[PDB]
Write an enzyme that holds these catalytic residues in place. Structure first.
Site, PDB file in Angstrom:
ATOM      1  N   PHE A 154      -2.674   6.183   2.798  1.00  0.00           N
ATOM      2  CA  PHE A 154      -2.451   6.740   4.045  1.00  0.00           C
ATOM      3  C   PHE A 154      -2.441   8.293   3.890  1.00  0.00           C
ATOM      4  O   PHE A 154      -2.420   9.003   2.835  1.00  0.00           O
ATOM      5  CB  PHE A 154      -0.834   6.543   4.413  1.00  0.00           C
ATOM      6  CG  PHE A 154      -0.643   5.046   4.855  1.00  0.00           C
ATOM      7  CD1 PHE A 154      -0.900   4.502   6.081  1.00  0.00           C
ATOM      8  CD2 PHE A 154      -0.099   4.028   3.932  1.00  0.00           C
ATOM      9  CE1 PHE A 154      -0.710   3.237   6.599  1.00  0.00           C
ATOM     10  CE2 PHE A 154       0.203   2.790   4.240  1.00  0.00           C
ATOM     11  CZ  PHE A 154       0.037   2.437   5.726  1.00  0.00           C
ATOM     12  N   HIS A 171      -4.290   5.023   8.009  1.00  0.00           N
ATOM     13  CA  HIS A 171      -5.504   4.750   6.966  1.00  0.00           C
ATOM     14  C   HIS A 171      -6.531   5.383   7.156  1.00  0.00           C
ATOM     15  O   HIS A 171      -7.504   5.606   6.332  1.00  0.00           O
ATOM     16  CB  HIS A 171      -5.586   3.154   6.953  1.00  0.00           C
ATOM     17  CG  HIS A 171      -4.784   2.177   6.333  1.00  0.00           C
ATOM     18  ND1 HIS A 171      -4.163   2.573   5.181  1.00  0.00           N
ATOM     19  CD2 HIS A 171      -4.240   0.929   6.690  1.00  0.00           C
ATOM     20  CE1 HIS A 171      -3.233   1.560   5.045  1.00  0.00           C
ATOM     21  NE2 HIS A 171      -3.303   0.729   5.766  1.00  0.00           N
ATOM     22  N   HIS A 216       8.069  -4.022   7.259  1.00  0.00           N
ATOM     23  CA  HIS A 216       8.639  -3.931   5.998  1.00  0.00           C
ATOM     24  C   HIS A 216       8.754  -2.566   5.225  1.00  0.00           C
ATOM     25  O   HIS A 216       8.103  -1.682   5.595  1.00  0.00           O
ATOM     26  CB  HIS A 216       7.388  -5.090   4.988  1.00  0.00           C
ATOM     27  CG  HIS A 216       6.250  -4.564   4.981  1.00  0.00           C
ATOM     28  ND1 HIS A 216       5.227  -5.475   5.453  1.00  0.00           N
ATOM     29  CD2 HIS A 216       5.834  -3.436   4.654  1.00  0.00           C
ATOM     30  CE1 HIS A 216       4.109  -4.696   5.347  1.00  0.00           C
ATOM     31  NE2 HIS A 216       4.211  -3.706   4.771  1.00  0.00           N
ATOM     32  N   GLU A 228       7.862   0.688   7.548  1.00  0.00           N
ATOM     33  CA  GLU A 228       6.533   0.693   8.300  1.00  0.00           C
ATOM     34  C   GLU A 228       6.550  -0.357   9.293  1.00  0.00           C
ATOM     35  O   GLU A 228       6.580  -1.403   9.257  1.00  0.00           O
ATOM     36  CB  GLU A 228       4.997   0.787   7.434  1.00  0.00           C
ATOM     37  CG  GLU A 228       4.913  -0.266   6.708  1.00  0.00           C
ATOM     38  CD  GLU A 228       3.621  -0.191   6.050  1.00  0.00           C
ATOM     39  OE1 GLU A 228       2.684  -0.325   6.705  1.00  0.00           O
ATOM     40  OE2 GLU A 228       3.511  -0.115   4.932  1.00  0.00           O
ATOM     41  N   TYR A 273       5.679  -7.573   9.543  1.00  0.00           N
ATOM     42  CA  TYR A 273       6.004  -6.186   9.783  1.00  0.00           C
ATOM     43  C   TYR A 273       7.407  -6.517  10.667  1.00  0.00           C
ATOM     44  O   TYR A 273       7.469  -7.408  11.332  1.00  0.00           O
ATOM     45  CB  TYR A 273       4.968  -5.630  10.560  1.00  0.00           C
ATOM     46  CG  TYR A 273       3.865  -5.135  10.139  1.00  0.00           C
ATOM     47  CD1 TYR A 273       3.758  -3.999   8.939  1.00  0.00           C
ATOM     48  CD2 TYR A 273       2.848  -6.099  10.025  1.00  0.00           C
ATOM     49  CE1 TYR A 273       2.548  -3.877   8.484  1.00  0.00           C
ATOM     50  CE2 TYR A 273       1.398  -5.663   9.478  1.00  0.00           C
ATOM     51  CZ  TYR A 273       1.385  -4.538   8.767  1.00  0.00           C
ATOM     52  OH  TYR A 273       0.306  -4.204   8.154  1.00  0.00           O
ATOM     53  N   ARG A 318       0.406   3.624  12.012  1.00  0.00           N
ATOM     54  CA  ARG A 318       2.041   3.167  11.571  1.00  0.00           C
ATOM     55  C   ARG A 318       2.873   4.270  11.648  1.00  0.00           C
ATOM     56  O   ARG A 318       2.569   5.474  11.655  1.00  0.00           O
ATOM     57  CB  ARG A 318       2.132   2.672   9.941  1.00  0.00           C
ATOM     58  CG  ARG A 318       1.065   1.904   9.495  1.00  0.00           C
ATOM     59  CD  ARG A 318       1.446   0.444   9.648  1.00  0.00           C
ATOM     60  NE  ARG A 318       0.308  -0.419   8.859  1.00  0.00           N
ATOM     61  CZ  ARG A 318      -0.893  -0.905   9.567  1.00  0.00           C
ATOM     62  NH1 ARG A 318      -1.255  -0.406  10.726  1.00  0.00           N
ATOM     63  NH2 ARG A 318      -1.835  -1.469   8.794  1.00  0.00           N
TER      64      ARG A 318
HETATM   65  N1  LIG Z   1      -0.450   2.896   0.759  1.00  0.00           N
HETATM   66  C1  LIG Z   1       0.762   2.223   0.573  1.00  0.00           C
HETATM   67  N2  LIG Z   1       1.048   1.080   0.976  1.00  0.00           N
HETATM   68  C2  LIG Z   1       2.458   0.750   0.646  1.00  0.00           C
HETATM   69  C3  LIG Z   1       3.491   1.650   0.315  1.00  0.00           C
HETATM   70  N3  LIG Z   1       4.737   1.038   0.408  1.00  0.00           N
HETATM   71  C4  LIG Z   1       4.338  -0.291   0.727  1.00  0.00           C
HETATM   72  N4  LIG Z   1       3.041  -0.327   0.989  1.00  0.00           N
HETATM   73  C5  LIG Z   1       2.403  -1.867   1.407  1.00  0.00           C
HETATM   74  O1  LIG Z   1       1.357  -2.151   0.744  1.00  0.00           O
HETATM   75  C6  LIG Z   1       0.191  -2.283   1.561  1.00  0.00           C
HETATM   76  C7  LIG Z   1      -1.275  -1.327   0.798  1.00  0.00           C
HETATM   77  O2  LIG Z   1      -1.900  -1.018   1.777  1.00  0.00           O
HETATM   78  C8  LIG Z   1       0.365  -1.589   2.746  1.00  0.00           C
HETATM   79  O3  LIG Z   1       0.037  -2.413   3.743  1.00  0.00           O
HETATM   80  P1  LIG Z   1      -0.689  -1.947   5.341  1.00  0.00           P
HETATM   81  O4  LIG Z   1      -2.245  -1.497   5.351  1.00  0.00           O
HETATM   82  O5  LIG Z   1      -0.363  -3.233   5.994  1.00  0.00           O
HETATM   83  O6  LIG Z   1       0.106  -0.589   5.773  1.00  0.00           O
HETATM   84  C9  LIG Z   1       1.682  -1.330   2.816  1.00  0.00           C
HETATM   85  O7  LIG Z   1       2.447  -2.240   3.651  1.00  0.00           O
HETATM   86  C10 LIG Z   1       3.215   2.902   0.142  1.00  0.00           C
HETATM   87  O8  LIG Z   1       3.859   3.855  -0.273  1.00  0.00           O
HETATM   88  N5  LIG Z   1       1.622   3.220   0.415  1.00  0.00           N
END
Ligand SMILES: Nc1nc2c(ncn2[C@@H]2O[C@H](CO)[C@@H](OP(=O)(O)O)[C@H]2O)c(=O)[nH]1
Ligand SMILES: [Ca+2]
Length: 104
Positions: A100, A92, A40, A58, A38, A77
């Site tokens: 999300f 989440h 990213h 995020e 992070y 986030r």
């Molecule tokens: N659900 C979701 N994940 C995303 C997206 N773009 C990138 N990702 C990445 O892929 C992972 C899927 O959950 C996410 O991790 P995170 O739980 O750390 O947020 C996130 O970092 C998006 O538009 N939606």
């Protein structure tokens, strides 16, 4: 009252600003923290109606009030863009699998 409500977590504007500044600073120096690296790119697969332009990044915001520095990022986030403009606060919580939903 909460400025942003992610499930049971209550955040003020200052909570979000503090988290965003931390993540953006890392983004500028081109550095990351945590095993999932992070901040990213957030691709916005959910298709939220953001008021600011992409690309989006995020960065986790913690209910403890601490700035993320590694380990479990929790469910919340803050999403900011290239100009350090707040795109939104997402979670989440209340969403299937790894999807999300926006915090109210
Ligand atoms: N659900 C979701 N994940 C995303 C997206 N773009 C990138 N990702 C990445 O892929 C992972 C899927 O959950 C996410 O991790 P995170 O739980 O750390 O947020 C996130 O970092 C998006 O538009 N939606
Ligand atoms: Ca707070």
């Amino acid at each position: 009252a909460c400025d942003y409500t992610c499930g049971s977590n209550c955040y003020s504007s200052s909570d979000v600003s503090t988290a965003q500044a931390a993540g953006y600073k890392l983004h500028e120096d081109g550095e990351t923290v945590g095993s999932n690296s992070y901040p990213h790119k957030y691709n916005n697969y959910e298709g939220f109606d953001f008021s600011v332009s992409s690309p989006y990044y995020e960065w986790p915001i913690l209910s403890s009030g601490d700035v993320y520095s590694g380990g479990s990022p929790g469910a919340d986030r803050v999403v900011f863009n290239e100009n350090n403009q707040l795109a939104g606060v997402i979670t989440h919580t209340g969403a299937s699998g790894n999807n999300f939903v926006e915090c109210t």
